[PDB]
Amino acid sequence: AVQQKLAALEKSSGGRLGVALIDTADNTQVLYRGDERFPMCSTSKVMAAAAVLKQSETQKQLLNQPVEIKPADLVNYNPIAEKHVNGTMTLAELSAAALQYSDNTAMNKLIAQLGGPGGVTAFARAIGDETFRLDRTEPTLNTAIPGDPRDTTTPRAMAQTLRQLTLGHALGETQRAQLVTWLKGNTTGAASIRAGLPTSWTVGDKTGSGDYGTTNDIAVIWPQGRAPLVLVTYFTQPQQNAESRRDVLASAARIIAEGL
């Protein structure tokens, strides 16, 4: 009934919906188009941040390293970086800004720290994620062009990776805790998965948004009284300037919750 409910939501929305739920109490999965590729957009900021966290396991003062923010470094959405122009931000501050405010300059700095998009993909591969690919920096990674494999992943692989990063051991203990702290402090997710879930649940999430009305969210969820969950929702639309449909992600989370 869950797959049918999700299919009906997709049909009503006019778009293409991808869902993956992992219930870690019993490791059950719920997927909808779970092996179809979707543009990741700013949800990629999770992987990049984790990759920097991974680097910091073997470079101890790495998170505290200042990075210079030049005027020319600013892109299309720089709510935090725009205040440190002609200054510096440490990698911890950049990671926090990327994850919790979706600052695209912060993301580009994280990518640069990793040696380019392929460094993020290389981190994905090193932790056993064989589907993720990051090809471009911000803002062009948000073009979300139908069928373009660049900067895409699948809901299933994204859910598994998010589990390894936040509940599994792809990262060291302190690094996993730091990533969880960052996700929990996200400021942009109130209207996405969170809006479809009971209000007493704790949620760490990362939203994303892009062209083709691309509207994404990936979350680790601690329900009241039960084992955590991973829920990824990737939504995209047929027209390039389509408006974001975050309510669709909320409705998918609501459907998925009623069956858990």
Residue 187: CB atoms within 10 A of its CB come to: 11
SS3 content of the chain, % helix, strand, coil (to 5): 45, 20, 40
Distance CA 11, CA 142 (A): 24
**Helix segments in the chain, DSSP class H:** 2-13, 44-58, 91-101, 104-113, 117-126, 155-166, 173-184, 246-258
Give dist(CA 88, CA 31) in Å, integer.
42
CA-nearest of 180, 159, 172 to 100 is 180
Q: Rounded to the nearest 5 degrees, what angle is found at the Cα of 169, between the Cα atoms of 260 and 111?
A: 100
Q: How far is Cα 251 from Cα 103, in angstroms, rounded to an integer?
A: 26
Instruction: Evaluate the omega torsion of the peptide bond into residue 139 and state whether it is cis, within 30 degrees of 0.
Output: yes
Sign of CA dihedral 240, 241, 246, 247: negative
| Residues in CB range of 168: below 8 A, 6 or more apart | none
Question: Can you tell me the distance from the alpha carbon of 17 to that of 247, in angstroms, rounded to the nearest whole number?
Answer: 12
The token pair at 232 is: 């990824």
> Which residue is it, tokens 């009284």?
225
Method of determination is electron diffraction
CA separation for the pair 86, 243 (Å, rounded): 34
Q: Are 214 and 208 in contact (CB under 8 A)?
A: yes
| Cα distances (Å, whole numbers) of residue 44 to 26, 28, 176 | 27, 25, 17
Which residues are catalytic, by number? Answer: 42
Amino acid at 69: I
142 annotated ligand binder: yes
| Helix residue ranges, H only, 167-228 | 173-184
Q: Which residues pair with 30 in a beta bridge?
A: 21
Q: What does each C-alpha distance from 80 to 48, 69, 99, 100, 153 come to in angstroms?
A: 17, 11, 11, 10, 27
Contact 101, 119 (CB under 8 A): no
Q: How many helices (H) and strands (E) does the chain have?
A: 8, 9
In angstroms, the CA 92 to CA 114 distance is: 14
3-state class of 249 per DSSP? helix
**Alpha-carbon span 248 to 234, nearest angstrom:** 10
In whole angstroms, how far apart are CA 34 and each of 21, 198, 214, 259?
9, 24, 17, 17
**CATH match for 1-260 among 3.40.50.1110, 3.30.300.30, 3.40.710.10, 3.40.720.10:** 3.40.710.10
Here the tokens at position 93 are 């501050």
Distance of CA 123 to the CA centre of its chain: 15
Alpha carbons 203 and 214: distance in angstroms, whole number: 21
CA triplet 169, 39, 31: central angle to 5 degrees? 60
Q: Quick one: DSSP state of residue 243?
A: P
CA dihedral 14, 20, 114, 121 (to 10 degrees): -90
Residue 138 marked as a ligand binder: yes
SS3 234: strand
Under 8 Å between Cβ of 100 and 203: no
Three-class SS state of 162: helix
Is the Cβ–Cβ distance between 127 and 161 less than 8 Å? yes
Q: In this structure, what token pair is assigned to residue 68?
A: 């210079």
d(CA 9, CA 118): 35
